[PDB]
Amino acid sequence: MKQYLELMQKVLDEGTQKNDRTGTGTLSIFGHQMRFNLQDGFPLVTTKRCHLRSIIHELLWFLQGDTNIAYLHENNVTIWDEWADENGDLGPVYGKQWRAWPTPDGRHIDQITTVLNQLKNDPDSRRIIVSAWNVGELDKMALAPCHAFFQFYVADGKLSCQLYQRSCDVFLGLPFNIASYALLVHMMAQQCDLEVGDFVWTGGDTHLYSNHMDQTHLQLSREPRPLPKLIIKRKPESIFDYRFEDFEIEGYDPHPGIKAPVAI
Amino acid sequence: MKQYLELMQKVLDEGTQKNDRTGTGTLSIFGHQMRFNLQDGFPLVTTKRCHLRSIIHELLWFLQGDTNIAYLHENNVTIWDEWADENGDLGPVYGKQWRAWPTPDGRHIDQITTVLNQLKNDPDSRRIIVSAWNVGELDKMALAPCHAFFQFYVADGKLSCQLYQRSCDVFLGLPFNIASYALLVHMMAQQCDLEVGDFVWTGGDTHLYSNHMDQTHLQLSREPRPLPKLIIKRKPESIFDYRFEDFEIEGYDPHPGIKAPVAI
Secondary structure, three states: HHHHHHHHHHHHHHHHHHHOOOOOOOEEEEEEEEEHHHHHOOOOOOOOOOOOOHHHHHHHHHHOOOEOOOOHHHHOOOOOOHHHOOOOEEEOOOHHHHHHEEEOOOEEEEEEHHHHHHHHHOOOOEEEEEOOOOOHHHHHHHOOOEEEEEEEEEOOEEEEEEEEEEEOOOOHHHHHHHHHHHHHHHHHHHOOOOOOOEEEEEEEEEEEEHHHHHHHHHHHOOOOOOOEEEEEEOOOOOOOOHHHHEEEEEEOOOOOOOOOOOOO | OHHHHHHHHHHHHEEEEOOOOOOOOOEEEEEEEEEEHHHHHOOOOOOOOOHHHHHHHHHHHHHOOOOOOOHHHHOOOOOOOOHOOOOOOOOOOOHHHHHHHHHHOEEEEOOOHHHHHHHHHHHOOOOOOOEEEOHHHHHHHHOOOOOEEEEEEEEEOEEEEEEEEEEEEOOOHHHHHHHHHHHHHHHHHHHHHOOOEEEEEEEEEEEEEEHHHHHHHOOOOOOOOOOOOEEEOOOOOOOOOOOOHHEEEEEEOOOOOOOOOOOO
8 A cells, every 4th residue: 555655664764763662672753644535445455465354343343332352252353362351351442432431420421423423413513533542541441542532524525534543553553453444434424324535544653663674675565556445235224233244345456464473 | 834834725725615613614624734843943933923922821721720711811811711601610621631630430630740750751652642532521611622632752852742633723723722832842841851852733624714815815925934942941840830931932023913803
């Protein structure tokens, strides 16, 4: 992908050497925004092979309000394992804030039903927002929300979404995180009878880890191949109703996978 | 100012006609990011005269955790009047979330002391964030947070800040809102013994109201005059200690004020 490749180049050319949490040096820039028009094709990186299945399964887990790893395990999805305790609990992380944000008076606010209410009945709102940055619960979560905050916008029957990501690893994390939300703009739009507009990605500490240098050089040498097309095979009766098999990606010919290790 | 003038031009050239809350048509774009390097001068618009005093006073009110209009009144600051009830209460809006975010278990989290702790003892954090988007309290606030969310970053002794603004009126609102946070990056940096870096502004529904068309045309015809220089005259003992008179702006020669009305 072109916008992504432009970002990769930029953190190599402009980033400051900054450390991780007593770890790995990174090259970091701060403050980057990229726009993906979803009508031009699905934003899945063609410059290295990326697979959709852990992406799809992790999102359906978010939408269920699940905070325990069990569902992912049933499906041999392992990405959150690193974070979960013995009984598979992750603390009040994303699914929890999204579907049952706790109030000081005992309520649990379902932010994505709110968002669907707002998109059908008041599409012109400037407050169509869901947040996972619940300050009162940050101390109990495995990790603090990386994609912390996002907002929808409707103009001319096109639903667009801006995401605020506080910290992103451009090589390993970012391809995954761009396709997860593009999937979500497409579930949302089908459920609201709106067309897809844009996915705007804004980031904060946007970084390359230094032991991913050869891999980014490899990748920056590859020409972006055309973008695939996502097809949702069923219109479920609601957004908490999609199932893994409702999704197909057609026309994707990526260049090979590049693996990249992590310090520990 | 150049970045601002570039934005004004862009919403006139690219915005979609979108309505307000049963009101005024606006021209709206969605998703804009601009960078101001604070070492190049203070970002106070020179293309129309803007005064600093309501800006300074409203920020000190935010920092006090005040939600009642009294302090502003004592000082003949009137900007929030439109919103306050009879007894001057505004609901749990900004000062309240900033200094006493309520947890579900009875605590009140002081987010800006947190932020100062993080900036002196762990300057490399990717979690140096304060949020005013307290979902549990949105129903009790006069209006929902417009500047909802912001994040600090330290690299090479330069403190930078990215702001997420969900809705901005580019003519009347935006000059005010850019100088308020630039002031805050400068209080923060003096208290942390860091230099100022960048102020990154990200916006969501960024709009011009249509009955501000002649005024924006007037203004887009004016050449940006050089940027002033803010001088803080005292180093208070903390951030809750600045006083109105600690601030002077030197070298500001703006073009005249342009007034712009609002529908009701």
